[PDB]
Amino acid sequence: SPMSLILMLVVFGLIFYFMILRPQQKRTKEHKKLMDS
Amino acid sequence: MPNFFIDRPIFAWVIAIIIMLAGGLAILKLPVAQYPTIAPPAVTISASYPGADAKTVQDTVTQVIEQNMNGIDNLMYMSSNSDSTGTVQITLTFESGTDADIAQVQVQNKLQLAMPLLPQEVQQQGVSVEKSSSSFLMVVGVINTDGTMTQEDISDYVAANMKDAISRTSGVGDVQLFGSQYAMRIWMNPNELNKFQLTPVDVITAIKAQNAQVAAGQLGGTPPVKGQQLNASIIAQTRLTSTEEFGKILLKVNQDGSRVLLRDVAKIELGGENYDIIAEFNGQPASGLGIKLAANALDTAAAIRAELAKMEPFFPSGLKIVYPYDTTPFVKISIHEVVKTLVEAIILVFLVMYLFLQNFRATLIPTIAVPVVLLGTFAVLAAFGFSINTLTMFGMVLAIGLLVDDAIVVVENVERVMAEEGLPPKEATRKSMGQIQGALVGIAMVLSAVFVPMAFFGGSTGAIYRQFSITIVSAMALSVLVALILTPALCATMLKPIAKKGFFGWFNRMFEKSTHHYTDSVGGILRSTGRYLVLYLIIVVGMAYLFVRLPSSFLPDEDQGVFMTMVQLPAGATQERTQKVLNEVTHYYLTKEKNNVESVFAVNGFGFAGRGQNTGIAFVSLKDWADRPGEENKVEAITMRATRAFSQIKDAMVFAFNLPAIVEFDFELIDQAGLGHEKLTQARNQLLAEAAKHPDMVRPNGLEDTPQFKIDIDQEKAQALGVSINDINTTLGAAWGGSYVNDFIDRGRVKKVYVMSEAKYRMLPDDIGDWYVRAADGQMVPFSAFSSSRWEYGSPRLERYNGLPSMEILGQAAPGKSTGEAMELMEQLASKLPTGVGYDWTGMSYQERLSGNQAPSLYAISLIVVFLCLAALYESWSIPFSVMLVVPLGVIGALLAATFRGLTNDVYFQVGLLTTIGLSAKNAILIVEFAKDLMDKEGKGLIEATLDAVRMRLRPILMTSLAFILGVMPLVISTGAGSGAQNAVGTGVMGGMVTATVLAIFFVPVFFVVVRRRFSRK
Amino acid sequence: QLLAEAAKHPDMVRPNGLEDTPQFKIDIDQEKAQALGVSINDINTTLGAAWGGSYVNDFIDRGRVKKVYVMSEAKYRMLPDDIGDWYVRAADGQMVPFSAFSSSRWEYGSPRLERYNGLPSMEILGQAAPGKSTGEAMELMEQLASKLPTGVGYDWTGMSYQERLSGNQAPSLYAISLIVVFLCLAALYESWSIPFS
Amino acid sequence: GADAKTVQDTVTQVIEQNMNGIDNLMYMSSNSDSTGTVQITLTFESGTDADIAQVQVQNKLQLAMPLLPQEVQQQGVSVEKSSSSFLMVVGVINTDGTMT
Amino acid sequence: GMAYLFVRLPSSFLPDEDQGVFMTMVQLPAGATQERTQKVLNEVTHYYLT
Ligand SMILES: CC1(C)S[C@@H]2[C@H](NC(=O)[C@H](N)c3ccccc3)C(=O)N2[C@H]1C(=O)O
Ligand SMILES: CC1(C)S[C@@H]2[C@H](NC(=O)[C@H](N)c3ccccc3)C(=O)N2[C@H]1C(=O)O
Ligand SMILES: CC1(C)S[C@@H]2[C@H](NC(=O)[C@H](N)c3ccccc3)C(=O)N2[C@H]1C(=O)O
C-alpha cells in the first residue's frame, strides 16, 4: 500500500539515529583504549 | 576480466541484462511451496474388515500382509496400527530421498502376492495404498446455509461432485474426505424375521438375487444365421435405484399365495456407509473435504477457490463453502517479506550511500548490483531441485544484505582512489579492481566453505540447511561476477573526481575525524599488543560460556493462524458422550475466545493416536494476525490458557496447541521372546510407571484395553439343533457389524447396499437372544439356545513394530539441551524388564542425527575448507589465523543478542552466526589484504602499512554495516505475521554485525600484526 | 440441441459416439418365478449363458491352453420369440418355459456409452477449417451451448485440450529473439545505437 | 455378453471411481462398448515416466478389481501404453484356398 | 507489404504429407447385421480394386 511516505521517512530517521549509535560505540571502545598507559 | 570488461561497457551491461531476463522466466518455472519436502516419503497400506475387531484384523489381515513382504528395498521401518473396526494401517517409511514412485510401486506387488488370503470381506472392501505428504494443503468444508442439510447429505453431495471435483484446479493431491457417500441401508429387525421364520441370510441373499445387473447376450450376434438383418442386445434385470424398489423385494411366500417383502422385515432408507465420524462447523451440521494435497502450491490453492463459483448457485438450500484450515496465506505473507525486505533494503541501502558517497550520479550502481543478482539467484534456484519457499526465501532476504555488501565494497575503493590518486574515472576504476580482485574471489569462495558445507547434512535437518546453504551460495555466486563484470563496468561509466559545503555535508568532516581517531588509535594500541591479546581470550572464554548457556531448538514454535485441540474419553464412551464433551470444547472458543477464534471444525470420533467413538479433534481457526494485538492474544497463550480452562473438565482429557511450524520423543517397545499383548502391556506398565520417578513436574501413545463381549458358539448344542455353524456366524456379524451385500446405482452413481440390524435390537448383551437363526429342521432357534456370554478385556487399537507385537511411547525431556541422555535412561531403565521385551526407535527419535547434534561436525570442518581456502592467498601460512581469529568477536555478539532476547539456538540462528562469521571474515580480509599488498606490492612497512590500511578500509566496513545492520532491524522486532523465524534470523545478525565491527576491527590490526611477528621468531 | 444449433453458422460439427440402438428388455417376474420353483439363478445363467456365451473351463488344444465357451447355436437365438424356446429346470424336477414367467418390451439404449472423468459425457468433433484463428471456433461452443440446461457443462479433450499449438504461441517466442538476438548482437564492441541495422 | 448398461455401471464405474489418488492424471477419457468392452484411457503430461506413469496406476486397479463381476475379473483386466500405431501391419493369407 | 502479405497467409500444423497409405470408413445403421456391414464393405473394396 501507499505507505512509502511513512516508511521512507522511517529511513531518514532510522539511518542517522542508528549510524552515530554505531560511530559512538566506536568512539568509546576507541578511548577506553587508554590501555596504552 | 575487470581491467578487461572495464573498457567495454555494453558487452558488460548486456551480460547483466541476460541474467536479469533469467528471472523474467525463472520466477515462473518455479513451484511456490509452503515447505521443502522435509520428510521421508512413505507408502501407507490401508485396509479394512467390516465389523471385525482388534483381534481378527490383527491376525487375519495385518499379519497376512506384514508377513508377506519378505523382500523390499529401503524398508527403513515398518510401523503399524490395527483399529478394532477393521482398519489396518501399515505405514512403510523410506530413507529421505528415494523414488517415492517406485518406492511404492515396488511394494504393491508384494501386497498382491498375499492379498488372495485376506478374508473375503477385506479383499472386497478394497485394500488401499498411498503416500503421505504435507497434510491437507487446505481443508475446505461444506455447510448448509438454509438449515436443510443432513449430517450425511453434505458428504453425499460432496461425494458425487466435489470430492472428484478436487482437480478442477491446475494441480491436485492423494487423499480427501470426511462424512460418508450415501449407501442403501436396510436396517433389519429380529422379531419380524423370527415371525416369518426368516434369517438375515435370506435377506442378504434376497438382495444379491433381485438386485444385480445381468448379462444377456443379444439377438443375432456372433456367428449369425446368414440373412439376419436385425441386431440388438438383450437387457435383463438391472441394478436398483429407488429407495423403494429395495423395499419391494421378495423374501418369501406362504400358503395363502401372500408374499413377504424386504420391507416387511426391515426399514429401508437412504443412509450413509458408516456412522462413526460426525463433523461440525461452529456447531453447524457440516462435512468437509480432506484435500490432503495438490506445481505452484500457492496457485493451486487459490484456484479451488476459483472453481468455487461452479457450486455457489448449485443446490437450493445454502451450501456455503468455508475454508477452516488453509496453509496458504503463509506464502503471500512470506513472498512479501522477501520483497518488502529487498524493497526496504534496496531503498535503505540507497540512503546510506548518499550520506557517504553523496553522489546520486553513482548511488545507482548498487541499485542494479542487487536486483540483477537476486534475479539470477532465482535462476540458479530452479537450476537445481529448489522451490520458492519460506526457507530459501530468507536466504534471498538474508543474502540480500550480504549481496548488497560487495556493492560498495566495490564502489568505495573504486572511488577511494578517485580522491587519493585524483585519477580519472576510467583509469582509476581499473587499479581499483586491481586489488579487491583476488580478495573478492577467495572471500567469496571462502564462505562457500561455510554455507555449502552445512548443506550436505543429516536427512531432515539438511533438508533445510541446503534449501538454505545454496540459496545463499547461489546468491553469493552472482555476487562476485555481477560485482566483477557489471559493477566495475557500471562504475567506470558514471563518475567524476577531484583530489579533494557545510549544511549536512559537513558530515564528511565528522567522519574524517573518526577516521583519524581510528588511525591515531590503532597505532598506539598496536605498540603494546599482549595487553589486548589477553583480553581477546577472556572474551573467547565468555563467548563459549555464553554459548553453552544457550538452549537448542529445531525451529521456532512459529505462530500459525491454526491450532489443534484433542478429546479423549474413557473406554466405552458412546458417541453421545464424546460429543457432549466436544460441545464444551467448541463452546469455550466461540464462548470465551470470541475476539480471535474464527471457527472450530470439530469431529466426533477421530483422534491422531486413537480411534473409534472415544476420540475427538477440533480444528480451531484463529482470526488473522493483524486482529490479535498482544502476545496473550496469540496462539502460544490462547492455547496455553484454554488447556488450563479445560483441566477441571473431569472424566476426559483435553488440550490444544500451536502447529509445529513445519510438518513432522517416540519410544518403541517390542514383544520379541514370544510373550503376548497382555504380558507386553504388562511391561509397558512397569516402565511408563517407573520412568515416572526421575521427572520434573513419558506416556504410551496407543489406547488402553477396552471391555469386550465374548460369545463362544457351542458347536454340539448347535449341531444337536441342526443349525449351520454358518447361518449362525453370518446371522450374527451380519446384523451386528454390517455386511456389504451388492451394489446399486443411486442417481447415476454406484453405491453400496449394507445390511445391519437397526439399533433398537443391538444395544445390549441380552439383545443377543433376540436373534433367531434357522435350522434345517425348518424351525427357528434362539442364539441363547446355544450361546453363552462372558466379559473379558481386549485392546481398542492394537499395534506391532516390524511384524512384531509392539507398543509406542512418547518420552519427552524438554530442557532443551542434550536429549542424547534422555534416550539413555529408557534403553537401560527398561533393561530391567522381562524376557522378550526389547526396545528401538521410531519416528522422530530414529532420525538420530538432528540439527545441533551434528552441527558440531560440519563446523570444525569449515575450519578446514576456510582456513584452507583463505590460505590460498599468496603465501597464507603463518598469517591465516588472523582472519580466522576475527571470528569469535562477531560470535560473542550474536550470542549476547539471542541470550538477552531470551532466544534459543534455532536453525535460522545456527544459520545466523554463519552469515556473521562470513562477515567477521569478510572485513578482516579487506584489511589484512591491503596490509599484505602494501608490505609486498611496494616498499616494506608493517605496522605503518596495516594502520594505513586499517584506515582506507574503515569507511567501507562501516558503510556496509550501516546497511546490513539496517536491512535486518526489520525482522528482529516483528512477531505479528510468521516472524518467529524472522526473529531468530534478524536478531541473529544484528548482534553479530555490531560486535562484528566495533570490536572486530581493532583486533585485526592486532591479530595480523602478531601473526606476522610470529614469523621472524624462527 | 447443440450439435443441431451449432449447425446454423456454418459454411457448406458432429458427435463422435454412436447413436442409441433398439434393445430388448426382459423383466424376470420373481413371484411367478418362485411360484414355479425355479432358482432366479438357474434362470439368469440359463439365459446369458446361451445368448451371450460363458467362459467355462480351459483345455489344452495341441499343446496350448485355450478357452471352452458355451452358447446356444444361432438357430435358437435370432429372434425375440426364440426366448420361449428356452426351458429352465425347477426344483420340482419339471421343465419350465421362460415365457411362463418372462415378458418382453422394446426400449432404446446406447451402443457405445461414454463418460469424461467418471462423469457421464459425450464427445463432439467441432471443426472450423478456414485455417486461421481457431481460438474463435472454440468460443462459440463454450457460449453457444451456454444456453443449455442444468448439469450440462463443457471442457476440452484430445487435440483441443492442448491449448497452445504451433503458431498460436509462435508469436510468443519470436518477439523473444528480438531480445536474445538484439542482445547477443549488441555484444559486438559498442553495439547500442547500431544494433537496429 | 453384458451390454452398455451393466458394463458402464458394473466395471467402468467400479474402476473409474477407485482411482482417487494418482499423479499427473491429465484427463481421464472413457468408452464402454455394448459387448463388455471398457477402455479407460489415461493421458499424462507430455514428458512423464511412461513406465512409472503406468506402474503408478495398476495398483489402484488392484485396489478395486476384487469388486468387478467374476466374469470380468476372470477374462482378465488389461492395461497398456499407446504408441505410434502399428509400426507395420503384416497380414496372413491362404494361397492354396484351404484356410478358414 | 510484408505484414499485410504475412497476415494474408494461412496456418497449417504440418502438411497433409502424402503417405502411400490411407484409411476409409464404413458406418451402417443401428442394428445392421454383420452381413449388411459386409455387403456395404464389399462395394467399398470393389471401387478401389475396380
Ligand atoms: C539433498 C541431497 C542431495 S544431500 C542428502 C543426503 N546426502 C548425504 O548425507 C551425503 N551423502 C553425506 C554427507 C556427509 C556424510 C555422509 C553422507 C541424501 O541422501 N540427501 C540428498 C537427497 O536425498 O537427494
Ligand atoms: C523446471 C526447473 C526449475 S527443474 C528442471 C531441471 N533441474 C534439475 O534436473 C535439477 N535441478 C538438477 C539435478 C541434477 C543436476 C543439476 C540439476 C532443469 O534444468 N529444469 C529447470 C528448468 O529448466 O527451468
Ligand atoms: C523436451 C523438453 C526438455 S522441453 C518441453 C517442456 N518444457 C517447457 O515447456 C519449459 N519448462 C517451458 C518453457 C517456456 C515456458 C514455460 C515452460 C517439457 O516438459 N518438455 C521437456 C520434456 O518433456 O522432456
Could you give a short description of this structure?
The structure is cut from a larger assembly and holds 1 copy of chain A (37 residues) and 4 copies of chain B. By secondary structure, chain A is mostly helical.
Can you tell me about this structure?
The structure is cut from a larger assembly and holds 1 copy of chain A (37 residues) and 4 copies of chain B. By secondary structure, chain A is mostly helical. Chain A has helices spanning 4-19, 21-31. Chain A has 2 helices and no strands. The longest helix of chain A is centred in the N-terminal third of the chain and has 16 residues, at 4-19. With 1018 residues, chain B is of the alpha+beta class. Chain B has 8 domains: 1-37 and 327-505, Multidrug efflux transporter AcrB transmembrane fold (Up-down Bundle); 38-132 and 795-802, Multidrug efflux transporter AcrB pore domain (Alpha-Beta Plaits, 2-Layer Sandwich), CATH 3.30.70.1430; 133-179 and 276-326, Alpha-Beta Plaits (2-Layer Sandwich), CATH 3.30.70; 180-275, Multidrug efflux transporter AcrB TolC docking domain, DN and DC subdomains, CATH 3.30.2090; 506-559 and 852-1018, Multidrug efflux transporter AcrB transmembrane domain (Multidrug efflux transporter AcrB transmembrane fold, Up-down Bundle), CATH 1.20.1640; 560-664, Alpha-Beta Plaits (2-Layer Sandwich); 665-705 and 803-851, Alpha-Beta Plaits; 706-794, Multidrug efflux transporter AcrB TolC docking domain, DN and DC subdomains. In chain B, a hairpin with a 4-residue loop joins β20 (739-745) and β21. The radius of gyration of chain B is 37 Å and the shape is elongated. The chains are: A mainly alpha (37), B alpha+beta (1018). The B-C interface holds B 8, 10-11, 14-15, 17-18, 21, 164, 209-210, 214-220, 222-225, 228, 232-237, 250, 253, 259, 748 and C 21-28, 30-31, 34-35, 40-41, 44, 47-48, 50-53, 71, 73-75, 77-80, 82, 107, 109, 117-120, 179, 183, 186-187, 189-192. β7 (232-235) of chain B pairs parallel with β1 (22-25) of chain C, so a sheet runs across the interface. One copy of the ligand CC1(C)S[C@@H]2[C@H](NC(=O)[C@H](N)c3ccccc3)C(=O)N2[C@H]1C(=O)O binds at residues 29, 382-385 of chain B.
